[PDB]
Amino acid sequence: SVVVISQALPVPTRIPGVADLVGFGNGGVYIIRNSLLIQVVKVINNFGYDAGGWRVEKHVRLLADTTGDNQSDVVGFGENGVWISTNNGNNTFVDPPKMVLANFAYAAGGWRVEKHIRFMADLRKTGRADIVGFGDGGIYISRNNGGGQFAPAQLALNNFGYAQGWRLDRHLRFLADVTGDGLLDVVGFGENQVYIARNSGNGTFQPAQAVVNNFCIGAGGWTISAHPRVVADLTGDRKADILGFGVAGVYTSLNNGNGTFGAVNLVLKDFGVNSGWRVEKHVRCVSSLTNKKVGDIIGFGDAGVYVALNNGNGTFGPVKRVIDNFGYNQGWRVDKHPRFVVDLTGDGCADIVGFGENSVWACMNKGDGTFGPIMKLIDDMTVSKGWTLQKTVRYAANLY
Ligand SMILES: C[Se][C@@H]1O[C@H](CO)[C@@H](O)[C@H](O)[C@H]1NC(C)=O
Ligand SMILES: C[Se][C@@H]1O[C@H](CO)[C@@H](O)[C@H](O)[C@H]1NC(C)=O
Ligand SMILES: C[Se][C@@H]1O[C@H](CO)[C@@H](O)[C@H](O)[C@H]1NC(C)=O
Numbered sequence: 001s002v003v004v005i006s007q008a009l010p011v012p013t014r015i016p017g018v019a020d021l022v023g024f025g026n027g028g029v030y031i032i033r034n035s036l037l038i039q040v041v042k043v044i045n046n047f048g049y050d051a052g053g054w055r056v057e058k059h060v061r062l063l064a065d066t067t068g069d070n071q072s073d074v075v076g077f078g079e080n081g082v083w084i085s086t087n088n089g090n091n092t093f094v095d096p097p098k099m100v101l102a103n104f105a106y107a108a109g110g111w112r113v114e115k116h117i118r119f120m121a122d123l124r125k126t127g128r129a130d131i132v133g134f135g136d137g138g139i140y141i142s143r144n145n146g147g148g149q150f151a152p153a154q155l156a157l158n159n160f161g162y163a164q165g166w167r168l169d170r171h172l173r174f175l176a177d178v179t180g181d182g183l184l185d186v187v188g189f190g191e192n193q194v195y196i197a198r199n200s201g202n203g204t205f206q207p208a209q210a211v212v213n214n215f216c217i218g219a220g221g222w223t224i225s226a227h228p229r230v231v232a233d234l235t236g237d238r239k240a241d242i243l244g245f246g247v248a249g250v251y252t253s254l255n256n257g258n259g260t261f262g263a264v265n266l267v268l269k270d271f272g273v274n275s276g277w278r279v280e281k282h283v284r285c286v287s288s289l290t291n292k293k294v295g296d297i298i299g300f301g302d303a304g305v306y307v308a309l310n311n312g313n314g315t316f317g318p319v320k321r322v323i324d325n326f327g328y329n330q331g332w333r334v335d336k337h338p339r340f341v342v343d344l345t346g347d348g349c350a351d352i353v354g355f356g357e358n359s360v361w362a363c364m365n366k367g368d369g370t371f372g373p374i375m376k377l378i379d380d381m382t383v384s385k386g387w388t389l390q391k392t393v394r395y396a397a398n399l400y
């Protein structure tokens with residue numbers, strides 16, 4: 001499946017891939033390299049709660065390739081600017097980080113976790129991640145001109161910003177290719193319409209175009225607290241479609257192929273509020289689990305993990321419980337135990353990793369959307385080793 005950057009998952013992972021694990025702990029940054037030797041390595045004495053005063057409430061911490069060598073660097077939007085530790089290539093990183101731009105920060109430009117969104121993305125096909133922010137007046141970009149040189153921020157589009165009424169408690173904003181040129185476009189679930197804005201590839205987006213009168217707070221009664229929405233390729237043409245977990249179950253609107261969108265249809269009477277699914281209890285994801293390389297549905301429910309496989313065209317097979325674990329009944333909690341659907345093995349069929357109370361656990365896809373046994377990875381990066389959602393940030397990420 002394709003590169004989509006979302007609020008929930010701001011660090012995309014590759015399909016196929018062998019993702020690593022990265023934790024911003026109280027003491028700094030730690031990695032678990034996906035390899036024959038599984039261990040935790042501390043790489044940076046910074047970007048932590050007690051290593052630089054980093055706070056989930058004020059600061060943003062991401063991974064992105066900022067040089068074009070396909071190795072992920074550590075990027076932090078700190079108190080007064082953007083800080084970067086680059087990947088040295090050998091399971092080490094530059095420490096300390098350097099400040100590349102005095103903007104996109106709590107005390108540089110007045111950026112706020114409660115009002116604004118900050119991502120890193122290669123928006124101009126340079127091979128390097130630019131800084132992209134949904135701020136007050138619209139979307140701002142700072143161009144990554146290479147050699148650690150980031151240009152002053154410029155307005156990319158006067159839309160999708162706080163000034164245009166966009167709110168984190170009502171609306172959703174994504175970056176995803178909806179046209180097929182490989183450039184990430186804006187997809188925004190607004191007050192009463194889904195909008196797209198076409199990336200021109202030059203640090204600007206085209207005027208926003210309304211494409212769907214649904215999936216929004218004021219179009220079908222879609223709420224942030226009950227009804228998660230995602231953007232993903234459901235058909236295999238590498239153009240993103242829309243999928244929402246609504247009241248009756250799963251609704252889609254399929255891309256016509258040019259970034260306009262078709263009718264909204266209920267495609268599966270499961271994974272929705274009426275089947276007992278709750279944002280506070282459960283995790284719902286779309287990722288490629290099969291050799292069809294299309295979005296399949298995965299839900300971490302009460303009794304375990306449930307999967308519905310896409311036939312290749314956006315229609316879905318029966319729901320099956322594939323793993324009797326990682327579920328609310330087994331003690332897993334949204335507010336304690338991060339769970340990700342990510343390729344860990346390199347076959348293109350996403351696997352499961354969960355940061356449990358005591359250990360990190362994985363479960364491998366057999367290659368067909370069914371799963372083997374649960375595997376212990378390590379006894380670290382967990383609640384009992386001092387990791388909480390309030391004070392730490394954890395990701396699956398392809399470091400290399
Ligand atoms: C006075 Se901000 C503080 O600066 C030091 C370097 O002086 C840096 O090590 C920290 O990471 C940074 N923390 C944040 C949150 O920005
Ligand atoms: C790239 Se900072 C951005 O700068 C413009 C002018 O440059 C200012 O009006 C914005 O309010 C400020 N902050 C945010 C959060 O959008
Ligand atoms: C009256 Se809603 C408002 O409409 C205008 C015009 O279409 C659009 O440019 C804004 O982005 C949209 N804002 C949200 C939050 O939906």
Ligand SMILES: C[Se][C@@H]1O[C@H](CO)[C@@H](O)[C@H](O)[C@H]1NC(C)=O
Pocket residue numbers: 214215219220221222223227245246247248251264
């Ligand atoms: C009163 Se539910 C509402 O039903 C209509 C069709 O009746 C559908 O278009 C909406 O998308 C759906 N909203 C959610 C959140 O499920």
Ligand SMILES: C[Se][C@@H]1O[C@H](CO)[C@@H](O)[C@H](O)[C@H]1NC(C)=O
Pocket residue numbers: 270271275276277278282300301302303306319
């Ligand atoms: C009483 Se849990 C329930 O089990 C059925 C199958 O028995 C499954 O199809 C549902 O989607 C699942 N819901 C949740 C929240 O896990």
Ligand SMILES: [Ca+2]
Pocket residue numbers: 176177178179180181182183184185198199
């Ligand atoms: Ca595009």
Ligand SMILES: [Ca+2]
Pocket residue numbers: 343344345346347348349350351365
């Ligand atoms: Ca796999």
